[model samples]
Structure formats: C-alpha cells, structure tokens
Target: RLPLDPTEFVRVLTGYLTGPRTAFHELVSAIAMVSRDSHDLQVAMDHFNRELMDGFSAHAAIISITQRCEYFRNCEAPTTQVTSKSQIPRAYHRRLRDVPEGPKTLGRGWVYIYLTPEGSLGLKI
Candidate 1:
C-alpha cells in the first residue's frame, strides 16, 4: 500500500482534476486501494466536496461515489439553522440573492441555503 494521508490525497486529487486526465488517473490509482477506515468519513467527504468545487471536472463521478458510499449516505448531513437575513453577513446578501430561491447547497462549503418562513434567505451548514 502507498503511504498517503487521506485528506491530503483527496486535496491533491482535486487539484489534479483540472490539470490532465493522466495525472488524475495516476493519483487515483495510487491511493485507490488504501484504507480510509481510520479517518472520519464525514470529514473526508467534506474535504472531497470542498476540493471538487475548486474546478474539478469529475463532479458527477465524485457525487456518485459520495452518494453511494455507505458512510456518507447513511450519515445525516450536519445541519445549521438560519433564522433571518440578519444572521447572515450583510456583504453576502447580493451574492446570495443571485442564486435562485429555495433550498440549495453551496459548493464551496458543506452548507445548504433555503428560504426561511420569514421570507428571508436561511443558510444551513
């Protein structure tokens, strides 16, 4: 087995996605058989999501694996409550509004946004 850090390996994989298919293939095959049993699955998934947002072309594949992974699918997504627009930083209002209304997941982080009952945007982590 190759000596690799799970978190760092995912980070590198994410970066390689935008470079060349050959590099991604090389990296994936290197760590593909290693065990992630020692790591927190949610944390690893979150790291994968974060890196995938950076410009990875295999989002469909990544999402597919994430949804199928036993640890990820069975675990409840961590939730955060958003009571009002006031709770969100004023600076983000414009960008937040730019997105279509309703519950949506933010790619840059493990967060979900939804319209609150009070008629304001609510962000859930």
Candidate 2:
C-alpha cells in the first residue's frame, strides 16, 4: 500500500514548536494549504486535507471534526485563526479535552508555504 497509505505529514509552522496546536495537527495542516495552488484553492484543499484527515479517520477514529478556511493574502502572522468556542462542538462541551494550549501560545513562531504558478508564497502563521 505504498502511496495509498495515508501516512502523510504536511510540515507547517516549520522548525517545530510546543503548544496546543500540537494537538490539532490535522486542523493546522488543512488550514495551512488555504492558498497552496495557483489554479484552484479548492484543489489544494482536498489534497492537503487528505494528508490531514487520513490520520484523523484512519488512526484516530475521529470522523466528526470539521473546519472552515479563508484566504488572507496580507496576513502579518498566523495570528489567531479560529475560535475555540466555535471550533469545539456541543457534544464535547463541558467534558471535552482541552486543545493542549491556547491560540496565544507561541513556540518559535509559525509559518506555512503556498505554491502558485506566478510565485511561491510564504506566510506567518
């Protein structure tokens, strides 16, 4: 099952770090590809998201998580992307596991790259 195996890992926030984001690798990985391709953003979304989601459903048995992404061509940093309250679901409310660290947590900063026919774009996450 060579290439078929869903053991892909898309590097985001290069250089690595420690924080709550560590727990949400799939989320981060999917969101990171919001602008990776030149022709269609949705195309990149499917590929990278598979890299992120394969691990979720295959190994973690978590098929319920969902996400929404947006393109920000002028972002200074990853800054803060999603709301915990909004992202987390109602079923996992009071008894849910924490996200590891708050969005404010920064470990060596963060970044993700995008490949466009015109040029390659790098943004601070």
Candidate 3:
C-alpha cells in the first residue's frame, strides 16, 4: 500500500511526485502536468494501484520510505530464518529494515503491522 493522505496529497503533491523510485517517473509525470486537477491525480493513483496489485508484495516491503524495496520479492529464496543483520542479501543490507535499532525486535517473522497511538497509519515490528 501507499502512505499518503488522500485528501491532502490530492491537491498539494508537494514534489512528492518527484518520487524516489524509478517507475514513478512516467506515472507521476501525468499528474505532474496539472497538480490542481483531481482527475489527473486520480489517474496517477489508479495507475500505481494497478502496479501494486500486479507485482508488488506489501509483505516483502520491509521499510518503504521515500521509495520502496522489493529484494524480498526479487530474491526468489525462501523466507529466510534471518536472525542477524549481516546474513541478508547484499542489496538488502542497505535498506531492508522492519524495525529500528533495538535488539528485542530482532529475528525473522518478528514483524507485524499495527496502529500507533500517534495516528492510525504507523507500522512497527
């Protein structure tokens, strides 16, 4: 899924369309032409939703920040036993984080999304 406030982001994309991912270039470009037009943004959102449903696995996306990472999907390996930070794939080493720096949250399958008290849209391991 995407992390966006539909009501707010619809009008004020805030250069968020200059996204951190490569695929975003073409789709986001459509809405980039007319930020004030809701139809333009809706189209942008719809196109991305299609991509999300088609190939992107929300499960494999550990830490989806400015962009997304899909090594967990691309690796084609089994769900790793994965208890150490150094054992993951080289590419995953850079960005696949399901939690912050806390030893208690370590280990495979230690992650599950939840609502944070701060807002309804936070996820923690």
- Each candidate's lDDT (Cα)? 0.42, 0.32, 0.32
Better of 1 and 2 by TM-score: 1
lDDT of 2 by residue, 17-84 (tens): 34434324533443344333433333333544564656643212211112122232222223324333
Clashing pairs in 2: 20-101, 78-124, 78-125
Candidate 1 TM-score versus the reference: 0.33
For candidate 1, give the lDDT of residue 79: 33
Candidate scoring better on TM-score of 1 and 3: 1
In order of TM-score, best first, we have 1, 3, 2
RMSD of each: 10.9, 14.8, 16.3
TM-score of each: 0.33, 0.20, 0.23
- Steric clashes per prediction: 0, 3, 0
lDDT of 3 at 78: 16
